[PDB]
Design a protein around this ligand. Structure first.
Ligand SMILES: Nc1ncnc2c1ncn2[C@@H]1O[C@H](COP(=O)(O)OP(=O)(O)OP(=O)(O)O)[C@@H](O)[C@H]1O
Ligand SMILES: [Zn+2]
Ligand SMILES: [Zn+2]
Lengths: 222, 474, 57
């Protein structure tokens, strides 16, 4: 039916987030779908034309704009294996175990191809060189670079990273064979805010005197 | 791209290498993701996961899993290297041929051919994980030797290796029989000529290989009965005092060096022999429990360049000097204090040997009758060179042991009398039967299908002459 | 009350363990208070004559 399916949607932690739970980012949504779903769902197209689909997909914007929501929605909708990596989670571990977690993520995603590796908050594990204080940050950055570069040419694996600013990440991560394609998310316009209000104010028992259009018009910079 | 070299290794090693050993985990309650996918708490647990071992009370990581961890950590596929070999046994001997602009070590040396400081540290993996005795009689007879004579004993244990599911990618050495070389045991110790021992063991090993066995360890008894009326022994070896004295550690290291473990992931082609050592001393309550040990790969590489000797203190091993042949650097042994900090202490005079040991776990096959043993024996025909006692193999003992069954029939009775390891070795030494006759005899005594072979043997001319002379002899 | 072999028996009167210990001291009771002294025995010998210490209990 829908969402790869009352039982057909016509617990489950942070699941069931589909394309209908995102509003006002249709351009970025189209870009992300083109970058992710097509290489995984229909690999025969690229073999026919004779190109290698992109691997890395950087994605950035102000906090609260729905980067994690969008990545999780794409991962759940594609119906393909995926592996969550959280930057703070990886960096909160004894020395020599952050690299172990990164290697495990990439290797296990490779085992069950097609796969999507969502490196949430990548700016906390591969930060800007000036703020890479110590031999642990450098070591984890180098491990991530190794895994990103040596991944493969035939494997059907895609990597999605979320961050706040383009300059908050180590410059070495934005080269060829790495997070080359990047997507930018900005504050929504009036229609986007109206769609978000419609999404959130659906379970709420609203009174008849609600002018969601008025709220969308009044909320600027939200 | 070069890879592992082409070298034949044991079947057990191959079948272990085939497996992956991953430990699956179910959806944790801390997971935040749908059915498909996995974050950090649901991913399969590697076979070398330290948390799993320490949670299950396992003190070492089943060497094959250590190799898996090394391969996972290093040797990226399709690029990044040309397959640096992951395993390399330590070597402390000085480079006698450096010629970096200087003559050999005795009259010149540079910073390139100078052995660096050695840092002892407890080994984190063990080659063989379990040692299993097929029957209780095998060690009951070994201890009966001491019971009757009062002196100590020493013998090699023959058997074969196999898988062990109770540990991730673990190996168990199953021991079928024990052979005792000619040794002069004494009240406080034992002595044995090395040359006689090895000369005899060469042919004994040839015969055992023809039978399918292999030499996989040595076992000795350290028992001193207490004065109590019952049969009890002092608990000489325990936590605070020594487990294995320095001398036996050195001997075990020599034995391990002489039985290399052919491996496909090392430049030399061998790494950390699968040779175990067992000792019978007695547990904390006053029993005759048995314990098995194995010296680390650095003690194995330390004794080769001399550099160690026994000390008057049982628990500590001495260190030799920088003579004109052997060059010993400064040796540090690393330990962790109660505050979780590693501390390096120079030990030139002497250091404890607990940093040169890894402990195995012994056991016996479950009472369920699997009957995978190669011999229904170890109680009967006297054993090897026990001439000190009344156990003296000779034609009279054969006439009294293996003649009534051969004078009646009952092929089952004859088979269960013919399947004695030491009886087979003795009849081989008699040399009455020709090589083909003895080959069919061993395959009749050790193979689960023996009816036809047993009939052929008993009908064979050589066996007929043997039994005829045995009957005639008195 | 204890057997004499607990410190002094065969292979202890051959290898002067008491002599080695006391000569290390002055560098007869044997105790593990002090420092070890090299005791080099030929390959193929095992010595079990060290004084007993018993469990902590
Ligand atoms: N179209 C939308 N855009 C943004 N947020 C949305 C949208 N629809 C719903 N939301 C809600 O807004 C919040 C967005 O938080 P979210 O964690 O997705 O943002 P983020 O700052 O990009 O993420 P992260 O810090 O985890 O990378 C969530 O409550 C989400 O449910
Ligand atoms: Zn999970
Ligand atoms: Zn040199």
């Amino acid at each position: 039916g829908k969402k790869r399916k009352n039982n057909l949607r016509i617990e489950n932690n942070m699941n069931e987030v589909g394309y209908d739970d995102i509003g006002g980012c249709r351009k970025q949504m189209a870009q992300i779908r083109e970058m992710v779903e097509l290489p995984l769902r229909h690999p025969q197209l690229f073999k026919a034309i004779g190109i290698k689909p992109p691997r890395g997909v950087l994605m950035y914007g102000p906090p609260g704009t729905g980067k994690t929501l969008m990545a999780r929605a794409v991962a759940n909708e594609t119906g393909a294996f995926f592996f969550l990596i959280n930057g703070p989670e990886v960096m909160s571990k004894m020395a020599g175990e952050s690299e172990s977690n990164l290697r495990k993520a990439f290797e296990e995603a490779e085992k069950n191809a097609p796969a999507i590796i969502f490196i949430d908050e990548i700016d906390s594990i591969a930060p800007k060189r000036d703020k890479t204080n110590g031999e642990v940050e450098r070591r984890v950055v180098s491990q991530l670079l190794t895994l990103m570069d040596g991944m493969k040419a035939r494997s059907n694996v895609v990597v999605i990273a979320a961050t706040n600013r383009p300059n908050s990440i180590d410059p070495a991560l934005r080269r060829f064979g790495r997070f080359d394609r990047e997507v930018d998310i900005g504050i929504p316009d009036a229609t986007g805010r109206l769609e978000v209000l419609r999404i959130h104010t659906k379970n709420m028992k609203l009174a008849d005197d609600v002018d969601l259009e008025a709220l969308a018009a009044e909320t600027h910079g939200y | 791209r070069y890879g592992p070299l082409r070298i034949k290794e044991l079947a057990v090693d191959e079948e272990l290498e085939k497996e992956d050993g991953l430990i699956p985990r179910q959806k944790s309650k801390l997971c935040k993701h749908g059915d498909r996918g996995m974050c950090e708490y649901c991913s399969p647990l590697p076979p070398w996961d330290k948390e799993y071992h320490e949670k299950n009370k396992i003190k070492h990581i089943s060497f094959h899993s250590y190799l898996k961890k090394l391969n996972e950590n290093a040797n990226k596929k399709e690029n990044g290297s040309s397959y640096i070999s992951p395993l390399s046994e330590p070597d402390f001997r000085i480079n006698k041929r450096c010629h970096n602009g200087h003559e050999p070590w005795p009259r010149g040396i540079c910073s390139k051919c100078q052995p660096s400081a050695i840092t002892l540290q407890q080994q984190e993996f063990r080659m063989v994980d379990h040692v299993e005795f097929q029957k209780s009689e095998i060690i009951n007879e070994f201890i009966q030797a001491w019971r009757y004579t009062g002196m100590q004993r020493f013998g090699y244990m023959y058997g074969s290796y196999s898988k062990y599911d109770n540990t991730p990618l673990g190996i168990k050495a199953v021991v079928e029989a024990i052979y005792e070389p000619p040794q002069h045991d004494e009240q406080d110790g034992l002595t044995m000529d090395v040359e006689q021992v090895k000369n005899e063991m060469l042919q004994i090993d040839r015969q055992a290989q023809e039978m399918g066995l292999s030499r996989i360890g040595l076992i000795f008894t350290d028992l001193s009965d207490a004065g109590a009326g019952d049969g009890s022994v002092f608990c000489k070896r325990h936590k605070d005092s020594f487990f294995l004295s320095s001398l036996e550690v050195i001997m075990a290291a020599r034995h391990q060096t002489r039985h290399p473990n052919v491996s496909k992931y090392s430049e030399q082609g061998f790494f950390s022999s699968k040779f175990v050592t067992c000792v019978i001393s007695g547990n904390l309550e006053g029993e005759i429990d048995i314990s098995s040990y194995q010296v680390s790969t650095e003690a194995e590489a330390l004794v080769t360049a001399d550099m160690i000797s026994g000390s008057t203190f049982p628990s500590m091993a001495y260190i030799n000097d920088t003579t004109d042949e052997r060059y010993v650097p400064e040796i540090f042994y690393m330990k962790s204090n109660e505050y979780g900090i590693t501390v390096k202490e120079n030990a030139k005079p002497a250091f404890p040997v607990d940093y040169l040991l890894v402990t195995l776990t012994h056991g016996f096959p479950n009472t369920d009758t699997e009957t995978n043993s190669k011999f229904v024996s170890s109680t009967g025909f006297p054993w090897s060179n026990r001439q000190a006692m009344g156990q003296s193999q000779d034609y009279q003992e054969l006439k009294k042991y293996l003649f009534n069954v051969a004078s009646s029939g009952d092929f089952n009775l004859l088979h269960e009398k013919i399947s004695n390891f030491h009886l087979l070795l003795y009849i081989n030494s008699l040399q009455i039967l020709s090589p083909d006759e003895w080959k069919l005899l061993i395959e009749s005594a050790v193979k689960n299908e023996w009816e036809e072979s047993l009939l052929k043997l008993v009908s064979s001319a050589g066996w007929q002459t043997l039994v005829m002379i045995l009957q005639e002899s008195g | 009350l204890d057997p004499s072999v607990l410190g002094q028996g065969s292979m202890s009167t051959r290898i002067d363990y008491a002599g080695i210990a006391n000569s290390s001291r002055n560098k007869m009771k044997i105790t593990f208070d002090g420092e070890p002294a090299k005791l080099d025995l030929p390959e193929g010998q095992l010595f079990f004559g060290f004084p007993m210490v018993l469990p902590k209990e």
